[PDB]
Ligand binder design. Structure first.
Ligand SMILES: [Mg+2]
Ligand SMILES: [Mg+2]
Length: 434
């Protein structure tokens, strides 16, 4: 019961790279088939590839017109990557996609990333006329990250998030605000250290109250998301970075997507600390990451063979940086990324990754009843013309399938499959009364 009740999630980076409604429906079909519960769809992640029908934004003592915001976001996303396959999903397409997923028992969790990984939103703000939205580090400007000292940029960004969250209200349950990898380009992946630095190394030109403002920012987004009845989620790396609780406290209602245990000189809070602070944790271990186009050993970090190895060697219960503690989880999430969005999207490669994650953790993933349902639909409805003995065998086989536990895992798939085979055999053995 506890294993099957977990969320099993596939994450798709449709922020950097365009994915069509058809492509996403196919992913949903596979997710359902392999026993997943949710699709985690990034739509704002460097690029921004989801447009509401009304994109008007009220901030900074004015309203930015819907059509101007749309044109700014379309231009801004293209400036990040002009994808020949498409620019954005429309509101009609999103609503249809969520409905399609819901009818299959699949939830959809969107991401609209900030204050990092927001190249397109920063570009859009510049197109609207907002001045100097980008964070800079000793003259090196981040293409991805907003300056938290810029009230006009921050106000616009929050109102944009609010607008998206208002749309997702009722139709989803979780909204990922991201919060990962602050100014990773401009600081050479040391952004959290940079934001915290002025407190400990004053008068050296580090951002004054940098990390303190980030906490306030994260918390305000959490408040905004919660106002819409949605649970806010965020990636772990900036949450109590360096295990430092002295700058302030994060909203406990933020679910933590735990993707990294950190690296040399990038010292993240342990999952133990985060649990102890009151956060629920979604295991998003980057052991399972796949970057499109990096399709085999040697082709770079998060290549497909690496991800498949991570899936074989790091179970769904193994959370980054536990300090040896027992870390409870709300579920697990395997993630595919489009760091190089011009890479060709290969469905079979993604589905292999998804299939392996489900098979490696089979007790956690729901069994497939699709074919059992179909087999029942294919039984002849009227059996009167057949012998009593052959009829009895069919009715017994039918009962046996309807008697199956409706909460079996992938680990018990063969139980379902044998029941299907037995029904098919009994139907084949139906004998006309002589
Ligand atoms: Mg590219
Ligand atoms: Mg492609």
């Amino acid at each position: 019961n506890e294993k099957l009740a977990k969320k099993k999630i596939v994450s798709i980076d449709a922020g950097r790279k365009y994915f069509s409604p058809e492509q996403l429906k196919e992913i949903i079909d596979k997710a359902k088939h392999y026993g997943y519960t949710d699709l985690h769809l990034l739509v704002g992640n460097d690029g921004l590839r989801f447009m509401l029908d009304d994109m008007s934004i009220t901030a900074n003592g004015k309203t930015y017109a819907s059509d101007d915001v749309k044109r700014a976001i379309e231009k801004g996303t293209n400036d990040y990557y002009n994808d020949p396959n498409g620019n954005h999903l429309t509101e009609s397409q999103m609503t249809d996609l969520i409905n399609y997923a819901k009818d299959k028992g699949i939830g959809l969790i969107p991401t609209v990333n900030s204050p990092g990984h927001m190249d397109a939103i920063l570009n859009a703000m510049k197109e609207l006329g907002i001045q100097n939205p980008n964070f800079s580090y000793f003259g090196k400007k981040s293409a991805r990250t907003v300056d938290l000292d810029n009230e006009q940029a921050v106000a616009f960004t929050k109102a944009l998030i609010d607008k998206y969250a208002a749309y997702f209200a009722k139709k989803t349950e979780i909204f990922n605000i991201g919060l990962d990898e602050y100014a990773n380009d401009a600081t050479d992946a040391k952004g959290w250290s940079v934001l915290q630095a002025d407190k400990y190394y004053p008068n050296e030109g580090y951002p004054v109250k940098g990390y303190e403002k980030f906490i306030a920012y994260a918390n305000d987004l959490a408040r905004i998301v919660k106002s819409h009845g949605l649970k806010p989620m965020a990636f772990n790396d900036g949450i109590y970075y360096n295990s430092d609780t002295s700058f302030g406290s994060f909203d406990k209602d933020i679910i933590v997507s735990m993707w990294t245990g950190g690296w040399g000189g990038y010292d993240v809070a342990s999952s133990k600390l985060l649990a102890e602070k009151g956060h629920q944790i979604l295991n998003t271990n980057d052991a399972w990451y796949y970057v499109l186009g990096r399709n085999a050993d040697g082709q770079g970090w998060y290549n497909l063979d690496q991800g498949l190895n991570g899936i074989k060697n790091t179970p769904i219960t193994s959370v980054p940086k536990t300090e040896g503690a027992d870390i409870p989880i709300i579920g697990g999430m395997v993630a595919a990324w489009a760091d190089t969005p011009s890479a060709r999207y290969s469905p079979s490669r993604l589905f292999k990754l998804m299939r392996h994650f489900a098979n490696a953790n089979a007790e956690y993933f729901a069994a497939d009843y699709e074919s059992a349902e179909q087999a029942l639909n294919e039984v002849p409805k009227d059996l009167n013309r057949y012998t009593a003995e052959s009829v009895t065998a069919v009715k017994e086989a039918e009962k046996a399938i309807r008697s199956l536990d409706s909460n079996l895992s992938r680990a018990q798939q063969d139980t379902i499959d044998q029941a299907i085979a037995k029904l098919q055999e009994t139907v084949n053995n139906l004998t006309l009364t002589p």
